[PDB]
């Protein structure tokens, strides 16, 4: 769990973004919603040791 509880947080954030997108209120789309390239797989990469 050295990298978890962070993607739970960032997937919570992306289900603030996808809420904000459906109503007409998401005015930085690719500036925010394509976080999941570097962010979000920011800490979805470790070698599963042991």
């Amino acid at each position: 769990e050295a990298r978890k509880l962070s993607p739970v947080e960032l997937e919570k954030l992306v289900r603030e973004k996808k809420r904000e997108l459906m109503e007409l209120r998401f005015q930085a789309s690719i500036g925010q919603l394509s976080q999941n390239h570097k962010i979000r797989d920011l800490k979805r990469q470790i070698a599963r040791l042991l």
Partner: protein, 92 residues
């Protein structure tokens, strides 16, 4: 994999009427798509959901090819009488 279930709500004239009784129909992840997403909506909006229904919608389209987007499952919560919260009342 709990916030990758409830994909999006729907702004619609029918799911603005869900705020009088039973909270709004979301498009849910149409596979891994159980009606026990009650522990995917109350773990997301901190409520106590009584009853959930289920669907399968959204067919075809022209412009050269078919299947307008997806065929996403979408339904709701019949969440307990006034834990209905979580700023949703915007737009309707």
């Amino acid at each position: 994999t709990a916030y990758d279930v409830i994909l999006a709500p729907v702004l619609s004239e029918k799911a603005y009427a869900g705020f009088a009784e039973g909270k709004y129909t979301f498009w849910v992840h149409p596979k891994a798509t159980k009606t026990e997403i009650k522990n995917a909506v109350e773990t997301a909006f901190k409520v106590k959901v009584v009853k959930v229904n289920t669907l399968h919608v959204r067919g075809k389209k022209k412009r050269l090819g078919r299947y307008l987007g997806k065929r996403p499952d979408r339904k709701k919560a019949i969440v307990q009488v006034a834990p209905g919260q979580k700023i949703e009342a915007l737009e309707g």
